[PDB]
C-alpha cells in the first residue's frame, strides 16, 4: 500500500527523503538556473512547515544559491505523530542527511544553514555537532531560553503522564490570517513530552555555545513574546564566533519573515547581503 503524507498524497508523486527511522520526510528544492554558489537548508520552526519560507526561498535562489528543506518529522506533509519526536537530535540528524546528500551532488560549495524558533535550535545543533563545516548561520528568532517555571511544571506533569494566541506572531493581520488557514501548521496546544524535548534542546543549546564557532547573523525582534530577546543577547554574548552579528527590530513580534512590511523588506534585504557577502 504506497506511503501516503497525513493530508493522504502518495510520497512517490513528490519530492522526500526517508530518514533513518524508515519515515519519510517531504523536501522542497528552489534551484537556480545556473551553476549553484552555495547550497542553504531552511530549518522551520515548531508547528510550521517548509513551504511558510517560498518568498525567502525565492530570494535565496535569485542570488544563485540552491535552496533545500524538508518539513521536520511530525510536521507539515512529512510522517509521524503530529509534533511528537523521540528525542531532539532526530531533527538534527535528518537536516545532516539531507545536507551530506545534496553535498554529494554538489560537491565543493559552501552550506549555510536558516533557522526560525525551533528551526534555529535545530540549526545551532547542527552547526554545533560539524564545527567548521557550515560557512554560516542565518537565525530568526530562535529557540535558545526556557522559563523556569514552565520548565520545572513539564517535568513534573511527563512524571504523571493550550494553543498560542496567533496575535503574539506578527503584527501584520494578514499574515496572523493566513498563518490561522494554513493546513499543514499545526496550531494545537504543545505535547508535555515535546514540550520536553523542546527544554533539551534549549540545555542542548547552553552547552553548545562554548564550541559554536560558525559565523551567523541574528535577528530578533524585541516585543517577541515566544523567544525573549534576552536569548538573542545571550546568544551574542556566549557563541564563540568571530563573526556574529544581531539585528534587534523595535517593536516586532515573532516572525519577523512575515511581520509589517517594512520589518519584513529589512528582513529580506539583511539576509540578502548577509549572504552575499560570504558567498562572493
Ligand atoms: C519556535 O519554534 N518556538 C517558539 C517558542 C515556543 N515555546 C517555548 O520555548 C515555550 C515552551 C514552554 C514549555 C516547554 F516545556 C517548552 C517550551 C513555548 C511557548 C512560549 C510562549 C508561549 C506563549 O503563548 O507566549 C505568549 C507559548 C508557548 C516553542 C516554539
Not at 530578533?220 to 538573542?232: E, I
Request: proline share 6%.
Amino acid at each position: 500500500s504506497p506511503r501516503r503524507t497525513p493530508q493522504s498524497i502518495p510520497y512517490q508523486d513528490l519530492p522526500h527523503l526517508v530518514n533513518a527511522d524508515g519515515q519519510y520526510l517531504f523536501c522542497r528544492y528552489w534551484a537556480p538556473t545556473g551553476t549553484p554558489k552555495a547550497l542553504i537548508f531552511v530549518s522551520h520552526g515548531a508547528g510550521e512547515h517548509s513551504g511558510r519560507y517560498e518568498e525567502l526561498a525565492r530570494m535565496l535562489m535569485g542570488l544563485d544559491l540552491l535552496v533545500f528543506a524538508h518539513d521536520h518529522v511530525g510536521h507539515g506533509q512529512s510522517e509521524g505523530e503530529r509534533m511528537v519526536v523521540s528525542d531532539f537530535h532526530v531533527f538534527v540528524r535528518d537536516v545532516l542527511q539531507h545536507v551530506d546528500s545534496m553535498q554529494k551532488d554538489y560537491p565543493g560549495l559552501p552550506v549555510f544553514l536558516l533557522g526560525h524558533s525551533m528551526g534555529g535550535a535545530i540549526a545551532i545543533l547542527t552547526a554545533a555537532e560539524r564545527p567548521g563545516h557550515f560557512a554560516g548561520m542565518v537565525l530568526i528568532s530562535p529557540l535558545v531560553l526556557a522559563n523556569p517555571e514552565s520548565a520545572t511544571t513539564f517535568k513534573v506533569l511527563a512524571a504523571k503522564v493550550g494553543p498560542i494566541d496567533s496575535s503574539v506572531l506578527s503584527r501584520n493581520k494578514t499574515e496572523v490570517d493566513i498563518y490561522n488557514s494554513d493546513p499543514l501548521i499545526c496550531r494545537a496546544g504543545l505535547k508535555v513530552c515535546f514540550g520536553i524535548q523542546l527544554l533539551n534542546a534549549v540545555s542542548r543549546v547552553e552547552r553548545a555555545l562554548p564550541k559554536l564557532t560558525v559565523p551567523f547573523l541574528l535577528l530578533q525582534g524585541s516585543a517577541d513574546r515566544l523567544c525573549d530577546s534576552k536569548g538573542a543577547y545571550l546568544l551574542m554574548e556566549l557563541a564563540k564566533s568571530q563573526d556574529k552579528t544581531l539585528k534587534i527590530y523595535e517593536g516586532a513580534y515573532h516572525v519577523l519573515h512575515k511581520e509589517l512590511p517594512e520589518v519584513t523588506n529589512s528582513v529580506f534585504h539583511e539576509i540578502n547581503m548577509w549572504v552575499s557577502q560570504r558567498t562572493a
